[PDB]
Design a protein around this motif. Structure first.
Motif, PDB file in Angstrom:
ATOM      1  N   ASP A 406       0.804  -1.126   0.037  1.00  0.00           N
ATOM      2  CA  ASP A 406       0.334  -0.332  -0.270  1.00  0.00           C
ATOM      3  C   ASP A 406       0.739   1.578  -0.317  1.00  0.00           C
ATOM      4  O   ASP A 406       0.867   2.169  -1.507  1.00  0.00           O
ATOM      5  N   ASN A 407       1.465   1.952   1.372  1.00  0.00           N
ATOM      6  CA  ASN A 407       2.855   2.413   1.201  1.00  0.00           C
ATOM      7  C   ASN A 407       3.913   1.525   0.969  1.00  0.00           C
ATOM      8  O   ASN A 407       3.629   0.508   0.620  1.00  0.00           O
ATOM      9  N   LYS A 408       5.016   2.321   0.736  1.00  0.00           N
ATOM     10  CA  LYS A 408       6.294   1.316   0.804  1.00  0.00           C
ATOM     11  C   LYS A 408       7.021   1.442   2.253  1.00  0.00           C
ATOM     12  O   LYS A 408       7.579   2.187   2.833  1.00  0.00           O
ATOM     13  N   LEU A 409       7.431   0.291   2.477  1.00  0.00           N
ATOM     14  CA  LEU A 409       9.355   0.406   3.178  1.00  0.00           C
ATOM     15  C   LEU A 409       9.471   1.538   4.576  1.00  0.00           C
ATOM     16  O   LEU A 409       9.617   2.216   4.603  1.00  0.00           O
ATOM     17  N   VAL A 410       8.273   0.345   5.429  1.00  0.00           N
ATOM     18  CA  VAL A 410       8.535   1.291   6.867  1.00  0.00           C
ATOM     19  C   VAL A 410       9.182   0.226   8.028  1.00  0.00           C
ATOM     20  O   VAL A 410       8.732  -1.260   7.478  1.00  0.00           O
ATOM     21  N   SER A 411       8.541   0.384   8.626  1.00  0.00           N
ATOM     22  CA  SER A 411       9.253  -0.653  10.089  1.00  0.00           C
ATOM     23  C   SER A 411       8.044  -1.531  10.796  1.00  0.00           C
ATOM     24  O   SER A 411       6.561  -0.184   9.840  1.00  0.00           O
ATOM     25  N   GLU A 412       8.110  -1.839  11.779  1.00  0.00           N
ATOM     26  CA  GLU A 412       6.976  -2.761  12.465  1.00  0.00           C
ATOM     27  C   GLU A 412       5.991  -1.352  13.640  1.00  0.00           C
ATOM     28  O   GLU A 412       5.493  -3.030  14.017  1.00  0.00           O
ATOM     29  N   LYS A 413       6.393  -0.543  13.428  1.00  0.00           N
ATOM     30  CA  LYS A 413       5.379   0.545  14.186  1.00  0.00           C
ATOM     31  C   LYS A 413       4.558   0.831  13.775  1.00  0.00           C
ATOM     32  O   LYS A 413       3.729   0.142  14.601  1.00  0.00           O
ATOM     33  N   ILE A 414       4.183   1.163  12.391  1.00  0.00           N
ATOM     34  CA  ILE A 414       2.809   1.612  11.784  1.00  0.00           C
ATOM     35  C   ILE A 414       2.739  -0.135  11.194  1.00  0.00           C
ATOM     36  O   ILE A 414       1.144   0.261  11.297  1.00  0.00           O
ATOM     37  N   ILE A 415       3.474  -1.048  10.934  1.00  0.00           N
ATOM     38  CA  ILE A 415       3.027  -2.526  10.900  1.00  0.00           C
ATOM     39  C   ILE A 415       2.269  -2.683  12.074  1.00  0.00           C
ATOM     40  O   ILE A 415       0.714  -3.480  11.464  1.00  0.00           O
ATOM     41  N   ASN A 416       2.626  -2.993  12.579  1.00  0.00           N
ATOM     42  CA  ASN A 416       1.803  -3.557  13.954  1.00  0.00           C
ATOM     43  C   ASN A 416       1.112  -3.203  13.801  1.00  0.00           C
ATOM     44  O   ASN A 416      -0.107  -3.574  14.427  1.00  0.00           O
ATOM     45  N   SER A 417       0.609  -1.840  14.235  1.00  0.00           N
ATOM     46  CA  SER A 417      -1.041  -0.581  14.568  1.00  0.00           C
ATOM     47  C   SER A 417      -1.847  -1.296  13.203  1.00  0.00           C
ATOM     48  O   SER A 417      -2.304  -1.750  13.252  1.00  0.00           O
ATOM     49  N   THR A 418      -1.513  -0.913  11.905  1.00  0.00           N
ATOM     50  CA  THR A 418      -2.178  -0.756  10.598  1.00  0.00           C
ATOM     51  C   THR A 418      -2.330  -2.186  10.748  1.00  0.00           C
ATOM     52  O   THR A 418      -3.160  -2.357   9.516  1.00  0.00           O
ATOM     53  N   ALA A 419      -2.350  -3.181  11.041  1.00  0.00           N
ATOM     54  CA  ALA A 419      -2.234  -4.485   9.559  1.00  0.00           C
ATOM     55  C   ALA A 419      -3.507  -5.018  10.189  1.00  0.00           C
ATOM     56  O   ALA A 419      -3.896  -5.777   9.382  1.00  0.00           O
ATOM     57  N   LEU A 420      -3.337  -6.057  11.616  1.00  0.00           N
ATOM     58  CA  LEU A 420      -4.473  -6.074  11.972  1.00  0.00           C
ATOM     59  C   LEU A 420      -4.831  -6.339  13.804  1.00  0.00           C
ATOM     60  O   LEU A 420      -5.280  -5.404  13.802  1.00  0.00           O
ATOM     61  N   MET A 421      -4.344  -7.598  14.192  1.00  0.00           N
ATOM     62  CA  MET A 421      -3.864  -8.082  15.588  1.00  0.00           C
ATOM     63  C   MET A 421      -3.151  -8.283  17.017  1.00  0.00           C
ATOM     64  O   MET A 421      -2.711  -7.233  17.465  1.00  0.00           O
ATOM     65  N   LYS A 422      -2.490  -9.096  16.151  1.00  0.00           N
ATOM     66  CA  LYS A 422      -1.143  -9.582  17.328  1.00  0.00           C
ATOM     67  C   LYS A 422       0.147  -9.756  16.818  1.00  0.00           C
ATOM     68  O   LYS A 422       0.007 -10.345  15.656  1.00  0.00           O
ATOM     69  N   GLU A 423       0.923  -9.617  17.983  1.00  0.00           N
ATOM     70  CA  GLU A 423       1.880  -8.960  17.488  1.00  0.00           C
ATOM     71  C   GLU A 423       2.926 -10.289  17.294  1.00  0.00           C
ATOM     72  O   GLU A 423       4.085 -10.834  16.381  1.00  0.00           O
ATOM     73  N   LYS A 424       3.152 -11.190  18.409  1.00  0.00           N
ATOM     74  CA  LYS A 424       3.481 -12.827  18.296  1.00  0.00           C
ATOM     75  C   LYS A 424       3.403 -13.484  16.976  1.00  0.00           C
ATOM     76  O   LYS A 424       3.868 -14.301  16.324  1.00  0.00           O
ATOM     77  N   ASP A 425       2.140 -13.442  16.886  1.00  0.00           N
ATOM     78  CA  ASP A 425       1.796 -14.182  15.054  1.00  0.00           C
ATOM     79  C   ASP A 425       1.910 -13.552  14.096  1.00  0.00           C
ATOM     80  O   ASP A 425       2.326 -13.806  12.512  1.00  0.00           O
ATOM     81  N   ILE A 426       2.492 -11.907  13.856  1.00  0.00           N
ATOM     82  CA  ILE A 426       2.956 -11.315  12.805  1.00  0.00           C
ATOM     83  C   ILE A 426       4.289 -12.429  12.872  1.00  0.00           C
ATOM     84  O   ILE A 426       4.543 -12.348  11.657  1.00  0.00           O
ATOM     85  N   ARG A 454      19.609  -3.732  16.464  1.00  0.00           N
ATOM     86  CA  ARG A 454      19.140  -2.170  16.987  1.00  0.00           C
ATOM     87  C   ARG A 454      18.982  -1.164  15.260  1.00  0.00           C
ATOM     88  O   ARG A 454      18.005   0.091  15.964  1.00  0.00           O
ATOM     89  N   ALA A 455      19.643  -1.207  14.624  1.00  0.00           N
ATOM     90  CA  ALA A 455      19.236  -0.543  13.021  1.00  0.00           C
ATOM     91  C   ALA A 455      17.829  -0.859  12.822  1.00  0.00           C
ATOM     92  O   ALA A 455      16.907  -1.766  13.116  1.00  0.00           O
ATOM     93  N   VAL A 456      17.109   0.184  12.231  1.00  0.00           N
ATOM     94  CA  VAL A 456      15.880   0.589  12.256  1.00  0.00           C
ATOM     95  C   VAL A 456      15.600   0.191  10.732  1.00  0.00           C
ATOM     96  O   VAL A 456      16.369  -0.821  10.048  1.00  0.00           O
ATOM     97  N   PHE A 457      14.071  -1.328  10.673  1.00  0.00           N
ATOM     98  CA  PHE A 457      13.961  -2.314   9.808  1.00  0.00           C
ATOM     99  C   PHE A 457      13.004  -1.975   8.887  1.00  0.00           C
ATOM    100  O   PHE A 457      12.339  -0.571   9.457  1.00  0.00           O
ATOM    101  N   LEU A 458      12.634  -2.286   7.796  1.00  0.00           N
ATOM    102  CA  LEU A 458      11.886  -1.681   6.676  1.00  0.00           C
ATOM    103  C   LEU A 458      11.064  -2.589   5.906  1.00  0.00           C
ATOM    104  O   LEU A 458      12.679  -3.447   5.181  1.00  0.00           O
ATOM    105  N   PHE A 459       9.963  -2.857   5.386  1.00  0.00           N
ATOM    106  CA  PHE A 459      10.112  -3.919   4.443  1.00  0.00           C
ATOM    107  C   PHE A 459       9.918  -3.305   2.519  1.00  0.00           C
ATOM    108  O   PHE A 459       8.559  -2.814   2.859  1.00  0.00           O
ATOM    109  N   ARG A 460      10.098  -3.582   1.759  1.00  0.00           N
ATOM    110  CA  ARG A 460      10.045  -2.940   0.025  1.00  0.00           C
ATOM    111  C   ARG A 460       9.884  -4.294  -1.031  1.00  0.00           C
ATOM    112  O   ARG A 460      11.154  -5.147  -0.398  1.00  0.00           O
ATOM    113  N   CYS A 461       9.185  -3.518  -1.987  1.00  0.00           N
ATOM    114  CA  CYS A 461       9.916  -3.964  -3.673  1.00  0.00           C
ATOM    115  C   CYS A 461      10.372  -5.659  -3.605  1.00  0.00           C
ATOM    116  O   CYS A 461       9.203  -6.331  -3.576  1.00  0.00           O
TER     117      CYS A 461
END
Lengths: 539, 89
Positions: A406-426, A454-461
């Motif tokens: 949808d958007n691109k290359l972002v960390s787990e911060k807004i992913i955990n929020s905006t995806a669905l529900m649970k951290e561990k299963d994600i 502890r360097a920042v992570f993103l997912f993309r492309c």
């Protein structure tokens, strides 16, 4: 343990073994040798075959050569050197084994699309003709006509011959039609740099324009030569009806076979997104307009030369403008419910096919409506791909795939929020998604150049890398499929030879039904994933 | 905390079938006030919108609204075969 898990064969044969597997079922032994070596080492010379394998010198090579040429399993080229003599180099030819991997599938569409003739003698007729075409690899008309029995209707089999030329399908045998796209471009490239009689040393960039533009127009006449020519086929002498040239031979073609299944993929997406009637209304359009639709033929200039960084678009959009031209210009004006085997005008059913567009189907021009063949492919690759992960894993794997898209290359911060529900299963399905490629991993540091965790992570492309993983699905599925089918042969070989001689006992009939069962199901699985691979080979 | 993330698994179930639904943000303004549970704020405007946004919930069409197509269909080895995955290659 015991290695029977087939870990032995699992690692070492990507692509490759595919080819020499097929031709082995085709012929085997020497035939698999040459091609398999023609693949691995690529470009190959006649003398070079003898050196490597010690292949039963000059008895096998000359025998395999003509054997590969009749079915055109080898791309042929000959040239010379400044020193002298001559050289002939062979390439692995197009996909011609893939056609051997096709066979009846091509004949299927041949029979099914031969309709507009209703359930006729044709079924047994051209099936005998077409099976004689592909098997021999080349067919002259007169020698074929000579095979037909006498004191009968001669033009009954010629009732559909001039109908075999048709629109697509069988075209004439022409010259250099088999030829490396890179080489023919270089051979046509002569007389271009060769063209100037010491003209003038002004504007070096004009040598670009000269060679290119003159090569493009000379390229178009060559590629459109097999495409549409009515000279040979439409010959009509008196004292008869239209009759194809008794001299010039024919050959099958990529045109409407690769197109017919491409429409099926469009139908599968259509039928999914609309009703059965709407899929038919859109179908009758495609059947008439498939002739001038490049589609599968799209790049055609891509293989054999550079594109550019700068001039890439000036190449690309030069194709896109002629991809704008022919679909816009040539294609059909509005018709009304043409024929078919709801009264009045059916354009209302087109308007509901209009208003609803995303992803596809019916984007239009004022006065004329047609579906673009350029912007259509991205949403075609999208759907099928998302359905692949859908079939493979559970519903969780689906939802996250788009969440990255949808958007691109972002960390787990807004992913955990905006995806669905649970951290561990994600995190679980994150590792399942990130398991095989396709999301890669993003590399950016935290308060250091390069140090540690502890360097920042993103997912993309990774669009092409998430493509190629379906190209691994090409061979290795069909591989063990066809292989252990062939191993099923040699195992029961002593039975099969007994069955052939018979063409007795309770238990001998048992294993007869066994193999035949396994055979029918293994070919149904072949064509199954075959239809899946075919859509993934582009973009 | 734990109360969160478990409240989105209920109210979104069957309301889909009763949805052309005009004004995408009104769809929440509808969903926001309903069930008498009185959901809190526009934080939910972009919630059910962009969470379930993918694969067959509701189709995305212009002028800010939602369509429906293929969800109606979804709501309605001997020797060697398949395995379809891993194995590398």
């Amino acid at each position: 343990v015991m290695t029977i898990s087939s870990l032995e064969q699992r690692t070492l044969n990507p692509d490759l073994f595919l080819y020499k597997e097929l031709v082995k079922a085709h012929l085997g032994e020497r035939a698999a040798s040459v091609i398999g070596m023609l693949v691995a080492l690529g470009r190959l010379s006649v003398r070079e075959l003898v050196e490597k394998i010690d292949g039963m010198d000059v008895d096998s090579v000359k025998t395999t050569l003509v054997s590969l040429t009749q079915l055109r399993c080898v791309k042929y080229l000959q040239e010379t050197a400044i020193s002298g003599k001559k050289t002939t180099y062979y390439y692995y030819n197009e996909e011609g084994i893939h056609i051997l991997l096709y066979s009846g599938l091509i004949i299927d569409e041949i029979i099914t699309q031969m309709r507009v003739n209703d359930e006729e003698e044709h079924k047994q007729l051209v099936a005998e003709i077409v099976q004689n075409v592909i098997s021999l690899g080349s067919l002259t008309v007169e020698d074929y006509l000579s095979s037909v029995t006498s004191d009968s209707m001669k033009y009954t089999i010629s009732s559909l011959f001039v109908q075999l030329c048709e629109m697509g399908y069988l075209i004439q045998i022409s010259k250099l039609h088999y030829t490396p796209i890179e080489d023919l471009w270089q051979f046509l490239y002569e007389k271009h740099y060769k063209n100037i009689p010491r003209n003038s040393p002004l504007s070096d960039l004009k040598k670009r324009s000269q060679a290119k533009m003159n090569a493009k127009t000379d390229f178009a006449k060559i590629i459109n030569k097999p495409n549409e020519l009515s000279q040979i086929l439409t010959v009509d002498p008196k004292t008869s009806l239209r009759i194809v040239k008794p001299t010039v031979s024919l050959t099958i073609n990529l045109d409407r076979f690769m197109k017919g299944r491409r429409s099926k993929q469009l139908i599968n997406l259509a039928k999914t997104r609309v009703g059965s009637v709407t899929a038919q209304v859109y179908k009758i359009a495609l059947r008439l307009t498939e002739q001038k639709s490049p589609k599968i033929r799209d790049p055609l200039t891509q293989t054999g030369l550079l594109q550019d960084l700068e001039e890439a678009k000036s190449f690309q959009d030069e194709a896109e403008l002629v991809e704008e031209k022919t679909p816009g210009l040539t294609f059909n004006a509005i018709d009304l419910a043409r024929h078919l085997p709801s009264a009045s005008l059916i354009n209302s059913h087109l308007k509901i096919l209009a208003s609803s567009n995303f992803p596809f189907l019916n984007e239009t021009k004022p006065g004329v409506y047609y579906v673009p063949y350029s912007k259509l492919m991205p949403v075609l690759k999208s759907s099928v791909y998302e359905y692949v992960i859908a079939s493979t894993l559970g519903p969780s794997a689906m939802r996250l795939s788009r969440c990255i898209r949808d958007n691109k290359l972002v960390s787990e911060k807004i992913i955990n929020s905006t995806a669905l529900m649970k951290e561990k299963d994600i995190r679980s399905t994150l590792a399942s998604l990130i398991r095989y490629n396709s999301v890669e991993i993003q590399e950016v540091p935290r308060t250091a150049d390069r140090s540690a965790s502890r360097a920042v992570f993103l997912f993309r492309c990774k669009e092409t890398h998430s493509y190629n993983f379906m190209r691994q699905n090409l061979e290795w599925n069909m591989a063990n499929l066809l292989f252990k089918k062939e191993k099923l042969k040699q195992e029961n070989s002593t039975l099969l030879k007994k069955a052939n001689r018979d063409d007795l006992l309770p238990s001998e009939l048992n294993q007869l039904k066994m193999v035949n069962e396994r055979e029918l199901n293994v070919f149904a699985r072949l064509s199954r994933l075959l239809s899946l691979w075919e859509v993934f080979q582009m973009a | 905390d734990i109360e969160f993330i478990n409240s989105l698994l209920t109210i979104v179930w069957r309301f889909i079938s009763e949805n052309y639904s005009t004004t995408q943000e009104i769809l929440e303004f509808i969903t926001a006030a309903q069930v008498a549970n009185v959901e809190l704020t526009p934080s939910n405007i972009r919630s059910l919108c962009e969470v379930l946004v993918y694969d067959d919930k509701l189709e995305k069409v212009t002028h800010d609204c939602y369509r429906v197509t293929l969800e109606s269909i979804l709501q309605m080895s001997k020797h060697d075969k398949e395995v379809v995955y891993f194995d590398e290659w």
